[PDB]
Short mmCIF file of C-alpha atoms in Angstrom, two decimals:
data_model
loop_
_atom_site.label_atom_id
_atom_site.label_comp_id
_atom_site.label_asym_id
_atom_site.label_seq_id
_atom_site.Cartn_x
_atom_site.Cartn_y
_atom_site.Cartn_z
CA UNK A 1 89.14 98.37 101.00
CA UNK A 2 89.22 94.76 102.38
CA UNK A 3 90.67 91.70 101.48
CA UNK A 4 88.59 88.68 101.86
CA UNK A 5 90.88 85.67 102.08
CA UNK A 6 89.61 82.17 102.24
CA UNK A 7 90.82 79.06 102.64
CA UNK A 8 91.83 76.84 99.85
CA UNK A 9 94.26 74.49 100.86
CA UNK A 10 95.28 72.02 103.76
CA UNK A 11 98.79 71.02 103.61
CA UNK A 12 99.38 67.60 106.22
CA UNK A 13 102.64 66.09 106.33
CA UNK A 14 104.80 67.27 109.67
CA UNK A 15 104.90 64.97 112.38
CA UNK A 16 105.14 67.78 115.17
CA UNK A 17 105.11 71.72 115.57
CA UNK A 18 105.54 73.46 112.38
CA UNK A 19 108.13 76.29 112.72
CA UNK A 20 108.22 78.59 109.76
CA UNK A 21 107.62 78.96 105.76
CA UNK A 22 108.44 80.82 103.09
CA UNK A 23 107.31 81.42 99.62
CA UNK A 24 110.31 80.86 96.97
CA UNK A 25 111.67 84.60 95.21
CA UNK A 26 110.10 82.77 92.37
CA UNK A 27 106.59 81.99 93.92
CA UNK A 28 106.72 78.31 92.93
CA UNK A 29 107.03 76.70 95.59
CA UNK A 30 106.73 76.89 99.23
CA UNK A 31 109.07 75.93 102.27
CA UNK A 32 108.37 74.48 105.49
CA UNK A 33 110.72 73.63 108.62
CA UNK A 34 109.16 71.75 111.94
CA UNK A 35 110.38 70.61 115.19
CA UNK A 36 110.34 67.17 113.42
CA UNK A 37 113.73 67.51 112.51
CA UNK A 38 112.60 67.79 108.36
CA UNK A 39 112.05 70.61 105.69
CA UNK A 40 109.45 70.03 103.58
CA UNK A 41 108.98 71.11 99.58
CA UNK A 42 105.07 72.04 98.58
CA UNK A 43 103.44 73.67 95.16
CA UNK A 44 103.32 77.17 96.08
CA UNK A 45 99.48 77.22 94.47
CA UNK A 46 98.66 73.56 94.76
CA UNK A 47 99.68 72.88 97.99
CA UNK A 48 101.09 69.59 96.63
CA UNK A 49 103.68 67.95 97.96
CA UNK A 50 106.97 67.95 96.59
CA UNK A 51 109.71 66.51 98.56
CA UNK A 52 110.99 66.02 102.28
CA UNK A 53 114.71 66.80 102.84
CA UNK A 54 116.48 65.87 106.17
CA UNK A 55 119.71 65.32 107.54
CA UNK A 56 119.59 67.74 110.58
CA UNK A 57 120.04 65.64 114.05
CA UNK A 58 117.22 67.90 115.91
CA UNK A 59 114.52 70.11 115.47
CA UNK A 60 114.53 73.43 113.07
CA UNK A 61 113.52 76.77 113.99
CA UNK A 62 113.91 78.41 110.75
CA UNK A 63 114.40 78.10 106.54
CA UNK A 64 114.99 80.53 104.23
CA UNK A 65 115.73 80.55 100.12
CA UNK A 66 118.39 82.14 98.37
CA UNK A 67 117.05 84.54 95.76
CA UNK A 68 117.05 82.55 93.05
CA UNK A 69 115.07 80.27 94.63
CA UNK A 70 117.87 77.30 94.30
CA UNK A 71 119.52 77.26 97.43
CA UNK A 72 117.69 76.76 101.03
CA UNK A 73 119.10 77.67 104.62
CA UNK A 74 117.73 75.83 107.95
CA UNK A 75 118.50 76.74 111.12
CA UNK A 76 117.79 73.89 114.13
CA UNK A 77 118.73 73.18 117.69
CA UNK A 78 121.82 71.05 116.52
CA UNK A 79 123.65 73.82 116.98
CA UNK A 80 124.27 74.54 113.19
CA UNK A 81 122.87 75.85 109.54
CA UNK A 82 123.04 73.85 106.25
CA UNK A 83 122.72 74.76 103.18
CA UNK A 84 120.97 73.00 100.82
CA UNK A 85 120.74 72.23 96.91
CA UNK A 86 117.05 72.28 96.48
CA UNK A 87 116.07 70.35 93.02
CA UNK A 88 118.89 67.32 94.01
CA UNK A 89 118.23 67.55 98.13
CA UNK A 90 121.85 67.37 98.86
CA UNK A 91 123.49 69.15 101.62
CA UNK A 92 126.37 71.69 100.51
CA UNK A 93 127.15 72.87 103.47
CA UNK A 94 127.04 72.85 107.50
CA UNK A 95 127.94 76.01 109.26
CA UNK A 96 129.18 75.47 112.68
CA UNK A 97 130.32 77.63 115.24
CA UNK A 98 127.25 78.79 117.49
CA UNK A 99 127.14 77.28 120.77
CA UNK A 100 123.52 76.84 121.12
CA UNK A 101 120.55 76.56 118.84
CA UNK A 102 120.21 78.75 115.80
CA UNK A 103 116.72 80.05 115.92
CA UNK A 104 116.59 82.24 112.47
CA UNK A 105 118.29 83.07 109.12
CA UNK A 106 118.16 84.61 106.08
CA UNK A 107 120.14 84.97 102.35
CA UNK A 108 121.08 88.37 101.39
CA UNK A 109 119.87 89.85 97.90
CA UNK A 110 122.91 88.84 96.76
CA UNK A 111 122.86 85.79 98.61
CA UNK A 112 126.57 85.26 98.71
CA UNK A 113 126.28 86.06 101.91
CA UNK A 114 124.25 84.27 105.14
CA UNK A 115 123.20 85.82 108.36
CA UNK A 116 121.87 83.50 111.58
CA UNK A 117 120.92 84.57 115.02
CA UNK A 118 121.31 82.47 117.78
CA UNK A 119 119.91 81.72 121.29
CA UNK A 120 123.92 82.09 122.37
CA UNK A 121 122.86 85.99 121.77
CA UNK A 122 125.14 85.83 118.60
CA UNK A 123 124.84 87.13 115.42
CA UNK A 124 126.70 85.63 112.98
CA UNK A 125 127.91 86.46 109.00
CA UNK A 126 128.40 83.56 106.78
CA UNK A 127 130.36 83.31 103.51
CA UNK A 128 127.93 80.47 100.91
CA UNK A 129 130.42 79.39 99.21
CA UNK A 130 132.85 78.22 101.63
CA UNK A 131 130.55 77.86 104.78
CA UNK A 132 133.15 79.92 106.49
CA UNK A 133 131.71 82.26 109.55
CA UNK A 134 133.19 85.55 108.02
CA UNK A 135 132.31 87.77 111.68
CA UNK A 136 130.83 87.03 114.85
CA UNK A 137 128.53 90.06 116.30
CA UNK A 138 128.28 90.41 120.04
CA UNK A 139 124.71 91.45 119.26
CA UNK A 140 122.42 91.01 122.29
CA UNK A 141 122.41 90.06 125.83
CA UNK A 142 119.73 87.11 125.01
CA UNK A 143 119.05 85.29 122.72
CA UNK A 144 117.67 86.57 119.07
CA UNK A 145 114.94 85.84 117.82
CA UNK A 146 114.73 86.85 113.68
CA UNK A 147 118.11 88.52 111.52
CA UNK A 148 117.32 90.35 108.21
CA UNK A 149 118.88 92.11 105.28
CA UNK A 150 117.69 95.40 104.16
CA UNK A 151 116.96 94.99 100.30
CA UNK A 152 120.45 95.61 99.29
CA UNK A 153 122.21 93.43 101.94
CA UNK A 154 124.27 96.46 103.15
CA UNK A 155 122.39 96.29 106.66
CA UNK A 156 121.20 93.95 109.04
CA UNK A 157 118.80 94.28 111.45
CA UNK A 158 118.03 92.02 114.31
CA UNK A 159 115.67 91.39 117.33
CA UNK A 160 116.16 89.82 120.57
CA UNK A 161 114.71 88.96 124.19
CA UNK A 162 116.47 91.56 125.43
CA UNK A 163 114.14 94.09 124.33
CA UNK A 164 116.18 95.79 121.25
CA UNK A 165 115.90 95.72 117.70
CA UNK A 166 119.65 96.74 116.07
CA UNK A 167 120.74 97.94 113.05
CA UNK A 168 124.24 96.72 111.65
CA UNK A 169 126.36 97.54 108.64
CA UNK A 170 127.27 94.38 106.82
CA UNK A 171 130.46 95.24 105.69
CA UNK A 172 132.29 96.30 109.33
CA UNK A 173 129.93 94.51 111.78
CA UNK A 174 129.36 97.80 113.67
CA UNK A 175 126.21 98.73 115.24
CA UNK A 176 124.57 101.74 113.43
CA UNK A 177 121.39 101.98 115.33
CA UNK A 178 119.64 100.55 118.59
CA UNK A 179 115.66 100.97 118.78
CA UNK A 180 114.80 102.19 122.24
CA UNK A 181 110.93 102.16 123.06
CA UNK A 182 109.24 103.22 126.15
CA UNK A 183 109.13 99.65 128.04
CA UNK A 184 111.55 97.49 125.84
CA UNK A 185 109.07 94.08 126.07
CA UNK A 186 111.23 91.13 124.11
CA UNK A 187 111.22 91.64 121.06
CA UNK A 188 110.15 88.12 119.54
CA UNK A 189 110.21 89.39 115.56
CA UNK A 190 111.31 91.88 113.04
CA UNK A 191 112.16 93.04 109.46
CA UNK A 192 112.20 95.15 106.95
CA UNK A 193 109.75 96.62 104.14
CA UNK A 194 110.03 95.75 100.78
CA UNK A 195 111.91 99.37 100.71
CA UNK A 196 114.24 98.53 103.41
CA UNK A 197 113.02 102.14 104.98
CA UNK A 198 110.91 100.57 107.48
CA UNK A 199 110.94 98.20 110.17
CA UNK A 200 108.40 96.04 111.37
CA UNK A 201 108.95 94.23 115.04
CA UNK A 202 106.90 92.26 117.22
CA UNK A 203 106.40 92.56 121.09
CA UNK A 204 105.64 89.81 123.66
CA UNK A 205 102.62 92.10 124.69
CA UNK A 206 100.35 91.47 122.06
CA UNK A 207 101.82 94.16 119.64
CA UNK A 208 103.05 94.72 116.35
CA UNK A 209 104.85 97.97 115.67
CA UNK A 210 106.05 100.16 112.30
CA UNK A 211 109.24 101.73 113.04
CA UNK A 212 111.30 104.60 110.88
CA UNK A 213 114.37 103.28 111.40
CA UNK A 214 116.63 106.54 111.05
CA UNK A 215 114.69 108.56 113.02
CA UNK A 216 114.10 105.47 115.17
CA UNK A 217 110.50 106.80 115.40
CA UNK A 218 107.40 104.06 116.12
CA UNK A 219 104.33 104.98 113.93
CA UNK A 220 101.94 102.92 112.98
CA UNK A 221 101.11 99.96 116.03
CA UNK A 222 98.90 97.00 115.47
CA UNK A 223 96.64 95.05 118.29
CA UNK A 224 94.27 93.23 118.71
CA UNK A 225 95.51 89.67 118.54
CA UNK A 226 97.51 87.22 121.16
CA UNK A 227 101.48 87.19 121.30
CA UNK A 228 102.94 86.78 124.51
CA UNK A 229 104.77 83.42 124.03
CA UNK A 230 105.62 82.47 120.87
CA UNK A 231 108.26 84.22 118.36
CA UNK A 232 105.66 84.84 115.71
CA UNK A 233 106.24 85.81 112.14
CA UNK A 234 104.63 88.79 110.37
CA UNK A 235 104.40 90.18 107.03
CA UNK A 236 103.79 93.00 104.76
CA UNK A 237 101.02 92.11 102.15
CA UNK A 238 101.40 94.28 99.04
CA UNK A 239 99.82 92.26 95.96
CA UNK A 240 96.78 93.84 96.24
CA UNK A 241 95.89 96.43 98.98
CA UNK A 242 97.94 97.19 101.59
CA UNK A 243 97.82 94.60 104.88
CA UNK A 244 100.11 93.41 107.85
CA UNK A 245 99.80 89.53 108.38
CA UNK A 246 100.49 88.30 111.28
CA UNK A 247 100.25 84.69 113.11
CA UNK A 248 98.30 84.35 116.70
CA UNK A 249 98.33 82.43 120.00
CA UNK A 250 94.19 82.36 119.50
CA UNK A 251 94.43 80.00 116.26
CA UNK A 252 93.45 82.68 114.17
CA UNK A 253 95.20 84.72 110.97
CA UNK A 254 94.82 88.95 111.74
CA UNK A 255 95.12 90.78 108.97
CA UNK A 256 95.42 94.76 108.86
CA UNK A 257 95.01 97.86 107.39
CA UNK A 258 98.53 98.84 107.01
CA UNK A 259 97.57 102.80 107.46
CA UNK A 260 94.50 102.29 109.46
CA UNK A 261 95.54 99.82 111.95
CA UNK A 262 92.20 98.72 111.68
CA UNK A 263 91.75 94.66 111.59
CA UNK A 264 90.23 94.00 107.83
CA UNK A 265 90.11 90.32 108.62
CA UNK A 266 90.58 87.10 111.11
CA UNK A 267 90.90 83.93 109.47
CA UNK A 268 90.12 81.14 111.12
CA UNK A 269 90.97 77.08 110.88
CA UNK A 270 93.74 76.39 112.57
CA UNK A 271 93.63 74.60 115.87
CA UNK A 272 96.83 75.45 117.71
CA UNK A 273 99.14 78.64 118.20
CA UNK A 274 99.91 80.27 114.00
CA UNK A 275 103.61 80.32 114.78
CA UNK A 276 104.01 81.98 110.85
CA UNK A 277 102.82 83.09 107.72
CA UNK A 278 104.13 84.10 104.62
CA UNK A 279 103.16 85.79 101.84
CA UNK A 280 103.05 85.18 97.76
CA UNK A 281 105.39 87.76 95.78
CA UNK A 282 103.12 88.50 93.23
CA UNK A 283 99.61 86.32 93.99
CA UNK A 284 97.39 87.58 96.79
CA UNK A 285 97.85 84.04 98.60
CA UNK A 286 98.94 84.14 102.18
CA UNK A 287 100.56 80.70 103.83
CA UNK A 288 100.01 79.78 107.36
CA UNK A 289 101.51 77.26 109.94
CA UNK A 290 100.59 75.59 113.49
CA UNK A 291 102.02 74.57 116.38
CA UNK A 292 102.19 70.62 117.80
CA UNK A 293 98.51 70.13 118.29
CA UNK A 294 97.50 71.01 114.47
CA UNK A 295 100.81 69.93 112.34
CA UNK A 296 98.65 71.63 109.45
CA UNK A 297 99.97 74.36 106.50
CA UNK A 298 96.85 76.32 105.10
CA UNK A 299 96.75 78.31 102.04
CA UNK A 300 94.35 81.05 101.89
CA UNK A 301 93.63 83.68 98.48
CA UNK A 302 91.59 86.60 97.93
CA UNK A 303 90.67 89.06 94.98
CA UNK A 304 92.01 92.02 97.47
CA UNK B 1 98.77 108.96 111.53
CA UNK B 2 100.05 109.45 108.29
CA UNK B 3 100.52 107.87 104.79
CA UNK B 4 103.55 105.65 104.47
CA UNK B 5 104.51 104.07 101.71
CA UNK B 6 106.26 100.81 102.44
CA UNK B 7 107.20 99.62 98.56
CA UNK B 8 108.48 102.49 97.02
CA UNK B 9 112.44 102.64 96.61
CA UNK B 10 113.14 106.01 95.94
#
């Protein structure tokens, strides 16, 4: 009925705000990006080191892996994306074309394809292979803040200051659906279930919301914690029970019931603003990152 | 309010 998470592992190694991370399709091995310019390899249940690789010329927002956990994206204020052989560290590929920094990304399933949102209100479709831009989307009038792929790469949706989450078809570009809610606060996450039938987005008013995205109904909303700054990411947990992760501008990890709403559990440890957290495909481990005053990556487990 | 099953790919 509860989970009860603990910490097991302190990860130290960034030299200023952590930005994101991500668990590898193959649960290996975890990802980190930071505003110190570097992504950094760790053992997904050691938290051991692995390797640093660089080569971007300022900070990064966002990584992400391809599915078979091979390939990495990074997005950073340099304006661009590279792709990245993981096991030799060598850079296949820089995507250019936004004109301001790239703040999120994201493989689809297939992972021939790349999609990046930008803080120049762009979406953007990427070919892997060549590192072409393959369309531009005029998606938002500020700048967005996470891009997805449903869980057969045929949509995308994507969240922005402005206030809207969007729904896109892949293959034309065209904008199926536009999430309308009763105050339209800026929206500073989102993505989709496992399923791809839901939607979960994040509000700069200290809430976390389930959307049907057909009917484009809200159902399930989360509170409780503190997000009113920082483009937070969130997560469904579905090892064990069922639980909504989510980072915190109070230092702490919430964790809820996903039918309930009810908060099962606060972790705490960190001591800055848990800009992300991740969670393990198959283990019931949950990874969490801090902002400039901590640098630190914790790794927490549980039986639930 | 109610269920909702987030996993299942029907």
């Amino acid at each position: 009925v509860k989970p009860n998470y603990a910490l097991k592992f302190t990860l130290a190694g960034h030299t200023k705000a952590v930005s994101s991370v991500k668990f590898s399709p193959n649960g290996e091995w975890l990802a980190s990006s930071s505003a110190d310019k570097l992504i950094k390899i760790w053992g997904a249940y050691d938290g051991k080191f692995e390797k640093t690789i660089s080569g971007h010329k300022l900070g990064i927002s966002d990584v992400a892996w391809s599915s078979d956990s091979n390939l990495l994206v990074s997005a950073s204020d340099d304006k661009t994306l590279k792709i990245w052989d993981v096991s030799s560290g060598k850079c296949l590929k820089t995507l250019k074309g936004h004109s301001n920094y790239v703040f999120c990304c994201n493989f689809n399933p297939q992972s021939n394809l790349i999609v990046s949102g930008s803080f120049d209100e762009s979406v953007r479709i990427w070919d892997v292979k060549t590192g072409k831009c393959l369309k531009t989307l005029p998606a938002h009038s500020d700048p967005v803040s996470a891009v997805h792929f449903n869980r057969d790469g045929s949509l995308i949706v994507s969240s922005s200051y402005d206030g809207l989450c969007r729904i896109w078809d892949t293959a034309s570009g065209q904008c199926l659906k536009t999430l309308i809610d009763d105050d339209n606060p800026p929206v500073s996450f989102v993505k989709f279930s496992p399923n791809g039938k839901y939607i979960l987005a994040a509000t700069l008013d200290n809430t976390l919301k389930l959307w049907d995205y057909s009917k484009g109904k809200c159902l399930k909303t989360y509170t409780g914690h503190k997000n009113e700054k920082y483009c937070i990411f969130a997560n469904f947990s579905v090892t064990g029970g069922k639980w909504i992760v989510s980072g915190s501008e109070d230092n702490l990890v919430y964790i809820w019931n996903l039918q309930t709403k009810e908060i099962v559990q606060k972790l705490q440890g960190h001591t800055d603003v848990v800009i992300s957290t991740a969670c393990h495909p198959t283990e019931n481990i949950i990874a969490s990152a801090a902002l400039e005053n901590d640098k630190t990556i914790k790794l927490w487990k549980s039986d639930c | 309010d109610e269920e909702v099953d987030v996993t299942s790919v029907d």
